[PDB]
């Protein structure tokens, strides 16, 4: 043979031994994929159906403002990490009673970017977005900044809303009391009417308070929002609002309107990873070979067999660690790196044709 | 689904990573279970048959005193640890010529308690007890205190004897000459006649000397016992006894009686873990699935294949480490935590019905 | 049973845990056995066919001098270690056009001694020898001294040549620029005519220069050799030679004769471990079960599957580590520890009968 049928210091060989050394334990993990944890945004989809039927934009704004708060609400007492989705992992949930269907494909493992797309069962809204959790270690706590723009298209009103979820932080992680706190600044934009809803998730510095307002294009406060993201959210007149001025309730301003309050967790919550009645349904047979319900890493943990799922986590990570190396010589099956049509940021637009059962060449993640 | 089909800090997660980190090498081990090492008490069963036929209680006491010494005698030059019996492990030995049959089930792995029961082939005695070795590290040596009461029921005389084996110590273990020494205080009680036999296993401080006496209920020395537990044991008159007063023989007092002396080890001893002619028989097909002869950990080591048995030790320990966790959501098959009927201490009474071949639901240890 | 069917401190048990702790990574390795790396001596076999046809001994000496230089010439830019041959590993190469056939059996793993034997296709020469690489770590470099005597028997002239390859050194290995250098002193002896060819592989201290001379029995310089082992080798008159007097050409003395120059490496060299056009042929079905082409450790690395070959390296080393222990209760199949018939050193004489396809009881290395 003329040549070969294949091609090609100690410290340099050591920088490769350290870069390859990555693993993951399975105890801080909870029996849910991150695609399933993000699916909890649709827990209060009724606020979207309520928003698409109101003829007043500021009343639509209150519902979208309440929906954004209700989406990040179920993150209380749930100090369990979701399974980091393997490259190509997908998930779908069709709630017949709530009236929505959602797709979510793990579109990137480096960085761990997750893209999703949801649509109304009666063609009333379209909900999609992408989230990349940037984990920051600092002091005795750990932050997690959900990088990405959320998009809610109100179909029958020919409008769309965009905002950014606030930063989630896990306090006292070294040797203390784990309690989750969410803070940051959320701004919702009505791209048709020009209405902006500013929301200020206050920090422990008063613990889970959320204060904000809703204004128009001329920048005039129309409603004053207040409450706690672990309890409720109110909408009171702005004039009467300004006239009022593991750490451990809300003060109802006269003339307030209860936009939304938390649904009580089922009795099975305290001893089952503090799940909500909606979260315990995330996990028949026509599902694709990539749906995380088929992931034996998450599945084996759900049956109580701990050590069985821990090895299959190392197994599935090792296959993803090996198949990624063989591709140096990836195809996003349901999303394409397209710009967000309302704000311009590089989003992940839903390609389509997923609800057609005819598909082939889906990667073999597990 | 309403709920789930299964239920549920870093430093706290580290105390679990350290508590779970337990393993065991297989080189200090010797190809014998601890149930087999303890079976060597019956090596000199003839002293029991000799005891049940004598009409003099103090002559019966001398034999039981000699039997207790002969039981811990074979522990010389045998610096090899026996295989720690897995939970539920059993062993049985029926010597047709010696005239006894013995059962021993590993009744507890935490703490490592071993319970046994032996009976005479001609219905002349009943021998049972429980032993828990408490290992103490100190200085450049290692002790092992056999916690538990030995019980010898002389059937035809309607009497029973009870005593406690002395502490075994392994000197010079770090980087020195391993030599076994046994010291402590043993007291044998004749619960029918009130005779007490005190035995003082002297320590290296003279090396393996054993001095003692036999007295009645009125506390009067009847016989004076002396000798070495690695050699012999004599019974001389108490009056003429008091008139006489790897480290490296006995002085026969005038008027002495040789109660017992050691049997010479076979020539195959020096190059086969210093076993005795009785110990090399401990390891046909109607044996239960728990008999340690069926343990592949001990078995593979007996054939010379070292590395084969070392992995199966890790395998059998890992199965015991996994099956114990699945029971948090044990059944002693042949012993029940009953009090010793002669002294009152919490012993392990032999339940019975073992010699009936009909049995089911025996745990799958290997 | 009378006895057993098998025979037999912490710090002493630790000296065994450290002596057994040996492994090997597979990245510095290159997809070639050391038996194949040494086979590159025959890359310029034409110099041997040219030597056996010349009627002048000093012209034969120049060719053997040029052949010895050309043998260690292909070690440039090849900073990849060959696979350490397992005990009993063999290799054979029959180049029909070059006119030679060579056998090489890994005759010893401790120390790693490799023995080979080559013969001319037209019965013109016999080439054999043994090499043991003594690895020395020093400073920021690593040496490798090829211990062993090379033997070239010129058949039709009834003479034989013997010499020793120079020391190979790998500079700047810690965290620097890996570049190979060969230095030492090589002396070729014509045992029939008494001619001696001294070769001085100069060191970096001028980088790869090689200066030497050829003298007779009366110790008189007949030819003066100069050049670089990575370029060429010349033979000029000794009188006109003395009249001339990652670090980074030759000066052609008037009246010089080009004995040999390097063959240009194929274009596939730079991105395929810097192999030569001859080296890329070392790796149909009548080959014995020991030929390193059948070694899956070297084979799997040749197909590009890296991690597949890395485990099979640990596998094949573990089998060699286990089969060597079972022999304490080895047979060299093609060489016998016989003294070299020309200089007297303990060589490895080729037994014979290898080219007969009838053979049995070859060890199962993989
Ligand atoms: C302590 C370690 C080992 C495990 C716990 C880390 C967990 C609590 C971290 C890792 C990633 C984080 C999540 C990243 C993304 C979101 C989406 C956001 O809209 C709500 C918060 C939420 C859900 C974060 C909650 C906290 C989180 C789940
Ligand atoms: C050095 C380590 C790793 C291995 C050696 C430990 C061995 C020698 C220890 C561990 C448990 C100990 C045994 C525990 C129980 C008994 C029963 C008693 O009636 C005689 C002594 C005897 C038999 C002990 C002898 C010494 C012993 C076997
Ligand atoms: C850096 C480490 C991990 C791997 C690299 C070590 C390599 C370069 C070393 C190990 C053994 C050495 C070889 C030992 C034997 C010979 C035969 C001699 O006639 C030419 C040099 C040669 C071919 C040496 C070249 C350098 C060598 C191949």
Author numbering:
A (entry chain A), B (entry chain A), C (entry chain A): 534 to 541, 551 to 747, 752 to 791, 818 to 820, 823 to 857, 864 to 909, 914 to 950
What does the primary publication say about this deposited structure?
To further illustrate the mechanisms underlying cholesterol transport by ORP1-ORD, we solved two crystal structures of ORP1-ORD (524–950 or 534–950) in complex with cholesterol. The most striking feature is that their N-terminal loops (residues 514–546) and lid regions (547–565) adopt different open conformations, distinct from the closed conformations observed in yeast Osh structures. To accomplish the lipid transport function, the ORP/Osh proteins were expected to adopt the open state when extracting lipids from or unloading them onto the membrane, and the closed state when transporting lipids between two membranes. Therefore, the open conformations of ORP1-ORD may represent certain important states when ORP1 exerts physiological functions (see below). In the 3.4 Å structure, the sterol molecule is similarly accommodated in the hydrophobic tunnel. Consistently, structural analyses of the open cholesterol-bound ORP1-ORD revealed domain swapping between symmetry-related molecules, effectively generating dimers or trimers. In these ORP1-ORD oligomers, the N-terminal loop of one molecule is nestled in a shallow groove on the core of a symmetry-related molecule, forming multiple hydrophobic and polar interactions. Thus, the lids in three oligomerization states of the cholesterol-bound ORP1-ORD, though adopting different conformations, can seal the lipid-binding tunnel.
